[PDB]
Design a protein around this ligand. Structure first.
Ligand SMILES: CS(=O)(=O)c1ccc(-c2cnc(NCc3cccc4c3CCO4)n3cnnc23)cc1
Ligand SMILES: [Ca+2]
Ligand SMILES: [Ca+2]
Length: 350
């Protein structure tokens, strides 16, 4: 990788999220979204390190602080869609062509920390909140499918979540130091997803009833000793981090335990390895994998970017000294974008 370009957004506020649109065809524009303050900004990556500003979305609320974004597509037209959320705890669906808000979702009792779209179903949106819960929405029928939380749910703010390869299960993590598994391929969840597609408030005066999922399918507090702020699946394995200068690779149960044979009472975990680094001991620092899950990247609090080959290189620039909150690889992994606390954007080309 080589740093080919850098820019700074006019608002001067930290950038907390960045996502390349992985739903674009080869030979079509390489587009990424950034989120900071009450702004959502789209950019195009061109040859010779060129970054072109496409459009900006400024939220009506000046007090809104976007923390996360996620791309999807309209299942009927294949047109891209962008979901954004933050401090207001409102999910906003943006048309990226016009950069206008199509619709919004209200429900969480507090800020939304992360948004994730189901890897098979482009209409299933997962939100994680400061209210200790996770919510699964069907954005085609504007329905709340399920709420993951309560008695055995997270006991503090949820910071991150990730669907596995097929979207059969979710792993969530947060301020209570725990990592919790939620199976969504259960007869109950599959039926709830099916029913959410049959719902239309214009053909019934009755509200759609959300599944109240009080119990996870696995839980551990034995990986990290502080806020778990990022979780990703690596096949049947888990990559997770706290502010303890390490990304831990682990799995539920004993070494040979199949993840789909794990019972909710499972008291064991197996640590398979760690990715060690420095000066990334502050809260709210995201690691990211490329589409192929062959590359791993994490920015640190003083502008250094760590990249590991999953099959360590430290990317540095003398002008990049602010905390790197999130990174995003282009679909082909040829480009790596880093976003910072000083509203700066950094482009690294392979
Ligand atoms: C400059 S400052 O004033 O010190 C500051 C620093 C961080 C935050 C902040 C950031 N992000 C989130 N949530 C999303 C989140 C969750 C897990 C990992 C992660 C992210 C974004 C990057 O990595 N926050 C929720 N409440 N506050 C925050 C706000 C102000
Ligand atoms: Ca399995
Ligand atoms: Ca299986």
């Amino acid at each position: 990788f080589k740093c080919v370009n850098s820019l700074k957004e006019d608002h001067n506020q930290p950038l907390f999220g960045v996502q390349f649109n992985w739903h674009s065809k080869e030979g079509d524009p390489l587009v990424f979204a950034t989120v900071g303050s009450n702004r959502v900004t789209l950019y195009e990556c061109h040859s010779q390190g060129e970054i072109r500003l496409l459009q900006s979305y400024v939220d009506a609320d000046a007090d809104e602080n976007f923390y996360t974004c996620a791309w999807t597509y309209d299942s009927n037209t294949s047109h891209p869609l962008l979901a954004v959320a933050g401090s207001r705890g409102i999910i906003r669906i943006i048309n990226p062509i016009t950069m206008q808000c199509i619709k919004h979702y209200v429900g969480h009792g507090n800020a939304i920390n992360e948004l994730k779209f189901h890897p098979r179903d482009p209409n299933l949106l997962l939100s994680v909140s400061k209210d200790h819960a996770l919510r699964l929405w069907n954005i085609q029928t504007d329905t709340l499918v399920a709420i993951f939380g309560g008695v055995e749910g997270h006991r503090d703010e949820v910071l991150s979540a990730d669907y596995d390869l097929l979207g059969e299960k979710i792993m969530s993590c947060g301020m209570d130091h725990s990592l919790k598994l939620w199976r969504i391929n259960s007869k109950r969840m599959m039926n709830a997803i099916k029913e959410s597609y049959d719902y239309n408030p214009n053909k019934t005066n009755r509200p759609f009833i959300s599944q109240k999922i009080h119990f996870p399918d696995f839980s551990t507090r034995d990986i990290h000793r502080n806020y778990v702020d990022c979780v990703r699946w690596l096949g049947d394995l888990i990559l997770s981090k706290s502010c303890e200068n390490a990304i831990v690779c682990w799995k539920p149960g004993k070494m040979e335990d199949d993840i789909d044979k794990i019972k909710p009472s499972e008291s064991n975990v197996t640590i398979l390895g760690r990715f060690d680094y420095s000066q990334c001991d502050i809260w709210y620092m995201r690691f990211s994998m490329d589409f192929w899950q062959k590359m791993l990247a994490l920015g640190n609090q003083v502008g250094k970017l760590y990249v590991w080959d999953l099959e360590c290189t430290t990317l540095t620039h003398h002008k990049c000294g602010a905390a790197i909150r999130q990174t995003s690889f282009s679909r082909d992994s040829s480009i790596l974008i880093a976003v910072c606390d000083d509203a700066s954007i950094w482009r690294w080309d392979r």
